[PDB]
Amino acid sequence: KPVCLVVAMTPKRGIGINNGLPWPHLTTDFKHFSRVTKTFNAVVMGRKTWESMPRKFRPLVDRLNIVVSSSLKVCASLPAALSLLEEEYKDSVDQIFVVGAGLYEAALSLGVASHLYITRVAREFPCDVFFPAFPGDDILSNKEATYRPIFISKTFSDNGVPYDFVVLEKRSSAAAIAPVLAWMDEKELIRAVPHVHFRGHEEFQYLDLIADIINNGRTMDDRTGVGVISKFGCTMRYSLDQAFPLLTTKRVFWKGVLEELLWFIRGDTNANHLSEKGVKIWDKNVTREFLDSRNLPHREVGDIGPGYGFQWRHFGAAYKDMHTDYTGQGVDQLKNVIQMLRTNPTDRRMLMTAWNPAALDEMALPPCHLLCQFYVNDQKELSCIMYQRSCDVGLGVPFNIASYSLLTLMVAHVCNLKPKEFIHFMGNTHVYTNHVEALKEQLRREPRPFPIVNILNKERIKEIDDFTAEDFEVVGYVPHGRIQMEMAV
Amino acid sequence: KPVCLVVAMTPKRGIGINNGLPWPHLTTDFKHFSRVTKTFNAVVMGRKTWESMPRKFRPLVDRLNIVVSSSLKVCASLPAALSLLEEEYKDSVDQIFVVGAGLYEAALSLGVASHLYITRVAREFPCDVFFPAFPGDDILSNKEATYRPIFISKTFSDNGVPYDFVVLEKRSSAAAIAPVLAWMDEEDKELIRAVPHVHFRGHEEFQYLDLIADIINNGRTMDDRTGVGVISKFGCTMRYSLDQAFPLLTTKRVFWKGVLEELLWFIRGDTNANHLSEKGVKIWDKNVTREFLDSRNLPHREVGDIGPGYGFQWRHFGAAYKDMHTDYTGQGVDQLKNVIQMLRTNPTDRRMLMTAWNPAALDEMALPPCHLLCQFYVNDQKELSCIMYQRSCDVGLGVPFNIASYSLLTLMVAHVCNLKPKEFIHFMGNTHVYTNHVEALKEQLRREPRPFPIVNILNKERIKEIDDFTAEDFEVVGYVPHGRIQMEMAV
Ligand SMILES: NC(=O)C1=CN([C@@H]2O[C@H](COP(=O)(O)OP(=O)(O)OC[C@H]3O[C@@H](n4cnc5c(N)ncnc54)[C@H](OP(=O)(O)O)[C@@H]3O)[C@@H](O)[C@H]2O)C=CC1
Ligand SMILES: NC(=O)C1=CN([C@@H]2O[C@H](COP(=O)(O)OP(=O)(O)OC[C@H]3O[C@@H](n4cnc5c(N)ncnc54)[C@H](OP(=O)(O)O)[C@@H]3O)[C@@H](O)[C@H]2O)C=CC1
Ligand SMILES: Nc1nc(N)c2nc(CNc3ccc(C(=O)N[C@@H](CCC(=O)O)C(=O)O)cc3)cnc2n1
Ligand SMILES: Nc1nc(N)c2nc(CNc3ccc(C(=O)N[C@@H](CCC(=O)O)C(=O)O)cc3)cnc2n1
Ligand SMILES: Nc1nc2[nH]c3cccc(Sc4ccccc4)c3c2c(=O)[nH]1
Ligand SMILES: Nc1nc2[nH]c3cccc(Sc4ccccc4)c3c2c(=O)[nH]1
Ligand SMILES: O=c1ccn([C@H]2C[C@H](O)[C@@H](COP(=O)(O)O)O2)c(=O)[nH]1
Ligand SMILES: O=c1ccn([C@H]2C[C@H](O)[C@@H](COP(=O)(O)O)O2)c(=O)[nH]1
Numbered sequence A: 001k002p003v004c005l006v007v008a009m010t011p012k013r014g015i016g017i018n019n020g021l022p023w024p025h026l027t028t029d030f031k032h033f034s035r036v037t038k039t040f041n042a043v044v045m046g047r048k049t050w051e052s053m054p055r056k057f058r059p060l061v062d063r064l065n066i067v068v069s070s071s072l073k074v075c076a077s078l079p080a081a082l083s084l085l086e087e088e089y090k091d092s093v094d095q096i097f098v099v100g101a102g103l104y105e106a107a108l109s110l111g112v113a114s115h116l117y118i119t120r121v122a123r124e125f126p127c128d129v130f131f132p133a134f135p136g137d138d139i140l141s142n143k144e145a146t147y148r149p150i151f152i153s154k155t156f157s158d159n160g161v162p163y164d165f166v167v168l169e170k171r172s173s174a175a176a177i178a179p180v181l182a183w184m185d186e187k188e189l190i191r192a193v194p195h196v197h198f199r200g201h202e203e204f205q206y207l208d209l210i211a212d213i214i215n216n217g218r219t220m221d222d223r224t225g226v227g228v229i230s231k232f233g234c235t236m237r238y239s240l241d242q243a244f245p246l247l248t249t250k251r252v253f254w255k256g257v258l259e260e261l262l263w264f265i266r267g268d269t270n271a272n273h274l275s276e277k278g279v280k281i282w283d284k285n286v287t288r289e290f291l292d293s294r295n296l297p298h299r300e301v302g303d304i305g306p307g308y309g310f311q312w313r314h315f316g317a318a319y320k321d322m323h324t325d326y327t328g329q330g331v332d333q334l335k336n337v338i339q340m341l342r343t344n345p346t347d348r349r350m351l352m353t354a355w356n357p358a359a360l361d362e363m364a365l366p367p368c369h370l371l372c373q374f375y376v377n378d379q380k381e382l383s384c385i386m387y388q389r390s391c392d393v394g395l396g397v398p399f400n401i402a403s404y405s406l407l408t409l410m411v412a413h414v415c416n417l418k419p420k421e422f423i424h425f426m427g428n429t430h431v432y433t434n435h436v437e438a439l440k441e442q443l444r445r446e447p448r449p450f451p452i453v454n455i456l457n458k459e460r461i462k463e464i465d466d467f468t469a470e471d472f473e474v475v476g477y478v479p480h481g482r483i484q485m486e487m488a489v
Numbered sequence B: 001k002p003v004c005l006v007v008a009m010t011p012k013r014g015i016g017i018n019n020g021l022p023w024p025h026l027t028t029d030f031k032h033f034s035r036v037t038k039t040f041n042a043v044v045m046g047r048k049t050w051e052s053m054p055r056k057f058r059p060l061v062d063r064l065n066i067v068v069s070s071s072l073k074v075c076a077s078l079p080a081a082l083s084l085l086e087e088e089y090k091d092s093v094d095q096i097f098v099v100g101a102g103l104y105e106a107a108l109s110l111g112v113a114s115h116l117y118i119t120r121v122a123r124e125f126p127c128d129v130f131f132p133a134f135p136g137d138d139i140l141s142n143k144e145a146t147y148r149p150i151f152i153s154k155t156f157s158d159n160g161v162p163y164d165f166v167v168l169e170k171r172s173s174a175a176a177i178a179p180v181l182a183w184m185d186e187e188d189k190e191l192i193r194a195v196p197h198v199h200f201r202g203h204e205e206f207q208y209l210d211l212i213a214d215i216i217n218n219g220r221t222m223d224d225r226t227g228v229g230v231i232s233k234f235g236c237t238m239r240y241s242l243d244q245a246f247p248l249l250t251t252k253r254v255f256w257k258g259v260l261e262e263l264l265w266f267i268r269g270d271t272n273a274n275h276l277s278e279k280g281v282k283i284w285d286k287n288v289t290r291e292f293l294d295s296r297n298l299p300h301r302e303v304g305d306i307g308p309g310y311g312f313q314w315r316h317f318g319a320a321y322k323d324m325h326t327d328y329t330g331q332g333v334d335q336l337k338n339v340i341q342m343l344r345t346n347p348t349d350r351r352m353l354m355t356a357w358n359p360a361a362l363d364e365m366a367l368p369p370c371h372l373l374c375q376f377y378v379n380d381q382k383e384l385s386c387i388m389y390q391r392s393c394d395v396g397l398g399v400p401f402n403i404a405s406y407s408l409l410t411l412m413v414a415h416v417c418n419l420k421p422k423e424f425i426h427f428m429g430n431t432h433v434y435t436n437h438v439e440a441l442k443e444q445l446r447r448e449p450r451p452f453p454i455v456n457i458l459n460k461e462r463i464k465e466i467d468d469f470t471a472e473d474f475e476v477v478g479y480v481p482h483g484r485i486q487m488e489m490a491v
Helices: A027-037 A047-052 A078-087 A103-109 A179-185 A204-216 A254-266 A271-275 A288-293 A308-314 A332-343 A396-413 A433-442 B027-037 B047-052 B078-087 B102-107 B174-186 B206-217 B255-266 B288-295 B312-316 B335-345 B398-416 B435-444
Strands: A003-009 A014-016 A039-044 A061-067 A096-098 A112-122 A146-152 A156-158 A162-172 A217-220 A229-241 A349-355 A370-376 A381-392 A420-433 A452-455 A474-477 B005-007 B014-016 B041-044 B066-068 B096-098 B113-120 B146-151 B157-160 B161-170 B220-222 B230-241 B353-355 B371-378 B385-395 B418-434 B456-459 B472-475
Touching: A003 A027, A003 A103, A027 A156, A027 A162, A027 B174, A039 A047, A039 A078, A039 A103, A047 A061, A061 A078, A078 A096, A078 A103, A096 A103, A096 A229, A112 B174, A146 B174, A162 A381, A162 B174, A179 B027, A204 A229, A204 A420, A204 A433, A229 A396, A229 A433, A229 B230, A229 B385, A229 B418, A254 A271, A254 A308, A254 A396, A254 A474, A271 A452, A308 A332, A332 A349, A332 A370, A332 A396, A370 A396, A370 B371, A370 B418, A381 A396, A381 B230, A396 A420, A396 A452, A420 B230, A420 B312, A420 B371, B005 B014, B005 B027, B005 B102, B005 B472, B027 B113, B027 B157, B027 B161, B041 B047, B041 B078, B041 B102, B047 B066, B066 B078, B078 B096, B078 B102, B096 B102, B113 B146, B206 B398, B206 B418, B206 B435, B230 B398, B255 B312, B255 B398, B312 B335, B335 B371, B335 B398, B371 B398, B385 B398, B398 B418, B398 B456, B418 B435
Parallel strands: A003 A096, A003 A112, A039 A061, A039 A096, A381 A420, B005 B096, B005 B113, B041 B066, B041 B096, B385 B418
Antiparallel strands: A112 A162, A146 A162, A156 A162, A217 A229, A229 A420, A349 A370, A370 A381, A452 A474, B113 B161, B146 B161, B157 B161, B220 B230, B230 B418, B353 B371, B371 B385, B456 B472
């Protein structure tokens, strides 16, 4: 008699309003709902849930229906509705399904539910009916039997609404090839949330990367003196067609991403412009003491030299200081990339580099993310690869995933393309030794659905220089807590 | 009654000389032989094989030994051996292994052999005893039941000898999740696969072969610069191990002399393609004709001048280009010197990179670099690894050549920096097969890989700097590729 709950709920456990659904139509959720409930199977719904459904759908085709009212033409309650399933139906009736509140809370208190099939809607919506609070509730937001997630899907979206699917549970042909495999094969491996067998969420790539570097990396020294554990040659890829990979296992500093990127695009080399908006990510690397450690006593405090964005907009131009005007100097790699994207998308030379050996000594830091390449296919879908030489997995990586994915949206939009994928290529890939305990905590967190990032005022924005800080909404971002990690300078 | 043969052979099926083994000691192969034959099992050998084995090892421990001979103290033939095994031994005797020539040929004629366990020694050695010709032979060299390979390992080595293991054969919570998986598979013809019969695909060349299947089945058809038209994917990865052997691909013959000459040309900083052409390496010629130079708006270029590309940017990044005849010594950044310098002094530095992509000089080049960046890494055991990023990749023609080129550079660099080469890592942008290469590539996919060769640097003693290497300082050892497959270059 094991029973399974099938629900869609917002992060605050919201499920409905005005005897109806809080959110516009979720197509894929519906496909999911259909498939799960038939393989005959029994669905069991509360009085009012039956009404919510439009009549042409009301008898749920190819499934035994049950309503639990006391006033309609069908059982008196849930315990008596289980009886009906044992008494008759014992033949054919495979697994059962409960599909409104009060019928959910009924099933929880009577403790007959072994599994929960939960569509996590990432947005909050006005609601007047809620799913009961339960142990394992953390899977929804930051709010002895308990419900442990065993499955977590990729992020989907419909009508501007991001959503995940999770499932929670109460807690000699070629055997004569084996002796050879045996001898070819081989202390305590950490794994990100080991209880999740089916790891669809694309954020597992980042969580499994962290595990790999800690289990199989090699302890090394470095420029900073802090010490690392590293690997070399690592790969992640993030899909941009449904959702946006803003990491959920720790809050990513979104404003910083978006400001630094707009700062790159103007070709600005004054870190003070970032700092004065409360984005201090450059400050430790442009202090007097650090410019002097870089043999650049002539540099003003804040001046990053001819770095990142200077090279994007003015490659090979002679650098002076951060107040000087370079308009018309060097190669504008960004405009050329866009022009080629608009006029000839099959060209294979759509690249932008930040690596200029002639100028490395003049920069505060040698660039980390130093190359990106764009690719269009035959459906007008755009993808981007970025090659990063040196990757602080703790701190920089999540920020960088966001940064370059956002640039892919920005470029897709001015070129009249749909963004498809971000491909992340990593060289020296390291975890600072003093971030390890923090990262082990992070690996005990189950990811939440990815948000969507929208571009507002699309009508106004025609060229890449037209974007401002106020032209993006992040929708449905529900991360776990910030985890503090000190920057190795 | 099924039997298994266990052998090690050269490419010409050579197994013995002077009642001994042809090659120096192969440790892993001995491990392999021991682990396969005990799990009690019986081994069956010919008299002369019994006598090959040193005496301290002689009765092979923990195995029933049977010798076929007519002189000793033991059965008179193979049929007689298999009778022995059935009459007594039916208990605890699990599998039976045949381990000399002529015992191998009797076992193949009788037809009682179900699996062959063949260790493929990649070098030839003087041999006076051979393993019989058998259908499936083609796994060894370019020389009805057939023995088809089902398992093919990675390449190993010991004492300067590269080798493979292949195996031939005669011819609660799950339940609940199943439905949610079921619909995420559904949405979304006849898949092409490289040697599908091969179930355990350790040979690192399966990376290249599976990359060709993947582009063909899942890539999108597009136009391009050339007019020829391609199938493409975006963002592809391979990695090749360098500690044991060298990834010179075996499913078609790769042009070693071209790899090596071009790489040396790169290191010199040379931009004259005539110097390549004059040594019988014409890979640059179609891209430096008078005709191709004008279609690039460079009528002032002498035929063969590739402009300030590859090696020019490596040795003189940003220097002002004139022509292929000028001396640039001292001008621009010598990225290669710097990388080496950093590897010798500071192996944990994370800025060990070299790029040929210079957007200020791209129009002046005949061709924008394809392989445009490489970065180096040293771990805690003095092992050098290398990543190269290639923006555009002709999977049919250039990729194998590109794999060998940067792998060789890795060796060259590791040697002058006193490191051991470990791994070459290939990062690929626009990754594509030309449409007129497809039929040929599908043929190529029917060919199982052979063990990789080793590349030795000769005259290590005299070679202290990167500019010291010449064409005569390398040997390729044990290279046994399949035939060339002619594929024309899309101009
Ligand atoms: N997104 C989702 O996952 C889902 C959302 N919904 C939404 O939620 C709302 C419907 O849920 P809700 O309002 O809670 O109403 P329900 O559908 O749970 O129906 C409540 C009625 O069912 C009967 N009932 C429920 N529990 C008991 C009990 N323990 N003992 C006896 N009878 C019981 C009663 O009928 P009687 O009055 O006859 O005694 C009660 O009036 C709608 O807005 C609907 O759209 C519904 C299903 C799923
Ligand atoms: N690398 C490898 O895979 C292996 C290599 N080897 C090498 O091969 C050589 C040994 O092979 P090889 O020279 O062929 O000799 P074998 O070991 O096959 O033995 C030859 C002798 O065994 C007996 N014999 C063999 N076949 C028959 C038969 N069909 N019927 C009756 N008696 C038979 C005969 O002994 P009698 O004179 O008593 O009648 C014959 O003279 C050595 O150099 C050895 O190191 C051996 C094993 C493995
Ligand atoms: N995870 C999740 N997501 C939900 N939306 C959900 N909704 C409810 C209740 N609300 C309903 C709304 C519409 C229908 C309806 O007409 N459905 C057709 C759709 C067929 C198709 O489109 O394939 C069907 O069932 O074949 C049924 C119930 C209960 N649990 C739920 N759980
Ligand atoms: N594929 C293959 N490779 C071969 N070399 C091979 N050689 C022969 C004959 N030559 C032999 C010489 C010495 C031994 C010996 O003392 N071996 C130890 C290894 C101990 C260990 O390291 O475990 C053992 O097994 O305990 C065994 C065989 C026959 N078939 C063969 N087949
Ligand atoms: N060790 C370390 N040094 C960094 N310097 C940066 C400069 C700009 C952006 C970044 S990315 C970043 C910035 C703030 C917080 C996390 C990543 C870094 C960065 C980083 O991530 N790690
Ligand atoms: N389509 C295609 N065009 C090429 N132009 C080249 C110029 C120099 C080296 C190369 S590599 C190469 C290796 C073997 C044969 C031809 C080119 C290419 C090359 C290639 O491989 N494919
Ligand atoms: O976007 C960025 C910029 C910088 N870094 C960090 C990675 C290195 O830990 C740090 C120092 O660079 P190196 O000089 O060590 O490469 O820069 C990032 O991770 N992401
Ligand atoms: O080492 C090389 C050099 C060139 N090419 C090929 C890849 C491209 O198919 C062709 C030129 O096309 P574009 O990169 O120009 O699109 O050069 C390679 O594959 N490998």
